[PDB]
Amino acid sequence: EVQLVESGGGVVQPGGSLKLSCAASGFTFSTYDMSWVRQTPDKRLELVATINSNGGSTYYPDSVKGRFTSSRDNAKNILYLQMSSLKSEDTAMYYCAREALLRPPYYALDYWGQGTSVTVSSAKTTPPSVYPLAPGSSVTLGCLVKGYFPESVTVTWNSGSLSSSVHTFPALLQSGLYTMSSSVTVPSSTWPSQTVTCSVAHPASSTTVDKKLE
């Protein structure tokens, strides 16, 4: 099976550097041209680098040219992207993708990796504040999760038990930090009678809050 596995993403400050790597297997890597494509938070796609089979020729759009360098290791079968002078607008999911061999030739990306996340920001890791949302035959409850960085909270209700009537609202960036919320709906007969808890986890700050609704 063809596999492409990207790594080397992270969170950096404006002006910082990263080196992405994409390990390839299950095909003759040195035969194929390879690309890096990014997906920004607005869900738009942009080709950021292409390199030929042998590694001697590259192309970059003007958005990244002079800041990003692609290279490849045709022994161990690895594609690289050295990123420097990073800017907040470089925040994106970065994918490695293989260029199809077509005759006549078209640029077409036939295999893509899972991507690696890059965030460029002046923020530091910051734990969320977590606030319960309670009313004071069905009842809706929630948790407001406010002011955290980077954008990577998970919220579950009674440890995944309540699953099917949960809504998780996508995080918003405001003032350099993220905010999200989550709701659950349960029968009025089960609350306050049986306990409802929202468990909020934010790995970067080592924060787990199991908040009981009252």
């Binding site: 994918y95 199809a100 406010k146 609202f169 709701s183």
Partner: protein, 211 residues
């Protein structure tokens, strides 16, 4: 450079329905046009290359057409698992611009939102802040408006909204709206309302509390 645009931005269709979406280029691109499919949470996948050629192992329910500036992706009979964002790419000459995508979603019956309002929590208030939250849950179709009032006058300042993607089990949409204020200003007014305007009623659905 060549600019691309996709229409519509989002389309709802029934399972079994023939669907067509379109991509337009700023100049003739001579069939040098790729389509990708990106399912929620997953990497893009190649669907069509050279405007009309189906990628290996994709279903033949997909087809491409066009030439010149205008291109179409057709799905002969929509399946549930075709919900995705579809992107076109110009590959005539660099930069190889992507269109901004078309989201394909599923049709279902109309539903009015379930609206719930929440005062600031004691925990927040012990901190000096005051966030009032409104959820507008399980509605269809996706278009909706929310308006906050403080003692009957509209407030726009310090309102933030978030919208879910279509629910994978019931096909509804939901929205969360938060009005943030200082504890000091929250204390200057008694009545807090969120009003939801949606196609299912000519009147708004209005939920309220008094501090």
């Amino acid at each position: 450079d060549i600019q691309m645009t996709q229409s519509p931005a989002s389309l709802s269709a029934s399972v079994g329905e023939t669907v067509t979406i379109t991509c337009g280029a700023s100049e003739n691109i001579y069939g040098a046009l790729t389509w990708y499919q990106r399912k929620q949470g997953k990497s893009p996948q190649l669907l069509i290359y050279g405007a009309i050629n189906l990628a290996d192992d994709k279903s033949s329910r997909f087809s491409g057409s066009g030439s010149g500036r205008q291109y179409s992706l057709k799905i002969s009979s929509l399946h549930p698992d075709d919900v995705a964002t579809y992107y076109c790419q110009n590959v005539l000459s660099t930069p190889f611009t992507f269109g901004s995508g078309t989201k394909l979603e599923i049709k279902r019956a109309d539903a009015a939102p379930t609206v719930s309002i929440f005062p600031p929590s004691s925990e927040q208030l012990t901190s000096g802040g005051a966030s009032v939250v409104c959820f507008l849950n399980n509605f269809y179709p996706k278009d909706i408006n929310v308006k906050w009032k403080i003692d009957g006058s509209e407030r726009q300042n310090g309102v933030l909204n978030s919208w879910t993607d279509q629910d994978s089990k019931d096909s509804t949409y939901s929205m969360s709206s938060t009005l943030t204020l200082t504890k000091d200003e929250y204390e200057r007014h008694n009545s807090y309302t969120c009003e939801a305007t949606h196609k299912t009623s000519t009147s708004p659905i209005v939920k309220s509390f008094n501090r």
